[PDB]
Amino acid sequence: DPQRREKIIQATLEAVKLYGIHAVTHRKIATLAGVPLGSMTYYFSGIDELLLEAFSSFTEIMSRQYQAFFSDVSDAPGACQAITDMIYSSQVATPDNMELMYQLYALASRKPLLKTVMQNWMQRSQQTLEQWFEPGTARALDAFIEGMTLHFVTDRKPLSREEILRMVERVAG
Amino acid sequence: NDPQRREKIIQATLEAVKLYGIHAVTHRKIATLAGVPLGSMTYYFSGIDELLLEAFSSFTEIMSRQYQAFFSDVSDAPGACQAITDMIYSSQVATPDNMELMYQLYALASRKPLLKTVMQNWMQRSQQTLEQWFEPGTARALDAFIEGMTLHFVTDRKPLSREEILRMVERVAG
Numbered sequence: 001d002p003q004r005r006e007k008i009i010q011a012t013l014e015a016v017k018l019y020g021i022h023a024v025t026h027r028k029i030a031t032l033a034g035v036p037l038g039s040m041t042y043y044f045s046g047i048d049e050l051l052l053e054a055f056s057s058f059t060e061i062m063s064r065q066y067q068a069f070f071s072d073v074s075d076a077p078g079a080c081q082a083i084t085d086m087i088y089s090s091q092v093a094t095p096d097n098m099e100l101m102y103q104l105y106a107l108a109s110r111k112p113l114l115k116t117v118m119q120n121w122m123q124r125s126q127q128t129l130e131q132w133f134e135p136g137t138a139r140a141l142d143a144f145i146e147g148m149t150l151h152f153v154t155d156r157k158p159l160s161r162e163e164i165l166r167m168v169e170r171v172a173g
Numbered sequence: 174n175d176p177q178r179r180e181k182i183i184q185a186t187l188e189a190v191k192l193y194g195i196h197a198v199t200h201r202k203i204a205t206l207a208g209v210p211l212g213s214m215t216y217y218f219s220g221i222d223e224l225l226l227e228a229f230s231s232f233t234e235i236m237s238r239q240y241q242a243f244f245s246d247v248s249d250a251p252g253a254c255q256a257i258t259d260m261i262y263s264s265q266v267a268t269p270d271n272m273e274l275m276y277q278l279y280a281l282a283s284r285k286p287l288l289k290t291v292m293q294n295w296m297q298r299s300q301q302t303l304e305q306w307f308e309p310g311t312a313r314a315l316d317a318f319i320e321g322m323t324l325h326f327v328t329d330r331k332p333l334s335r336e337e338i339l340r341m342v343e344r345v346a347g
Contacts, residue, residue, distance in 0.1 A: 020196055022196065022197060023197075105267075122328065137341075154282060155293075167345070
């Protein structure tokens with residue numbers, strides 16, 4: 001059943017945030033999903049397979065909200081404003097989605113299938129930006145977004161939206 | 174106080190964090206990884222939180238020495254841009270072990286004020302390093318770019334060429 005699988009997937013993601021990768025178990029995910037422990041075994045082969053599916057699902061939802069910023073963009077100047085919106089909004093409120101995303105970078109370096117998921121996510125992001133930028137610039141821009149977003153977590157001095165826009169437009173070239 | 178031994182315990186704490194994650198690290202496991210008697214743990218560190226703090230702190234110092242070393246030969250902005258490129262292209266910053274330790278630190282920083290304090294200090298060091306050649310705003314942009322590019326470099330199915338990276342670094346540098 002599609003809906004219970006998805007609840008298990010979401011429970012898995014929330015579980016990673018609360019407990020960390022090593023500490024996650026079937027019992028914790030089942031309690032978090034409100035499902036019988038016996039059903040964790042049905043929908044997935046192992047805890048590892050589950051985590052992989054759940055990280056995959058997570059990147060798909062990152063991409064959907066990524067494009068969301070760009071649904072109204074029709075050219076490169078508009079894209080620089082959107083990218084600026086995205087970075088600025090991260091600054092003013094740290095999205096709850098990034099320590100999960102840094103975990104994934106580390107994990108990808110030891111887990112090839114996760115690396116495959118991550119490359120797939122990156123290509124999605126590139127493809128979005130490539131609507132308005134040549135491929136190299138698109139790669140630069142997406143790197144700058146992720147870098148700035150992380151930077152905000154532990155940065156004390158504030159950056160204004162305009163300062164961010166000026167940086168984004170320098171990268172866009 | 175025995176400096177050498179404390180430092181082996183610090184290092185062992187970092188090895189343990191990689192192996193078991195932060196919520197599994199114990200004095201006994203550090204003790205065996207460090208090759209020191211268990212009583213050395215009590216003599217050097219109050220609790221596990223203190224030890225983790227000092228270990229992650231030491232970790233950021235190692236990263237900082239490394240970061241600095243890329244600019245050893247640098248005396249002007251284009252040389253710094255070449256240095257930043259090397260730093261990205263070398264895949265020496267974002268190794269599997271460093272990325273995993275950086276995850277752990279980012280996470281704990283969200284949950285424990287003191288580790289956030291350790292991270293901000295680390296970031297200030299990187300910024301000061303770059304402000305030798307660049308304006309404070311540009312320094313900040315470059316450091317953010319380095320963070321994103323290094324992660325993309327080791328992950329990308331086909332990463333950017335070195336000259337492409339240089340070209341982009343030079344854009345950010347303005």
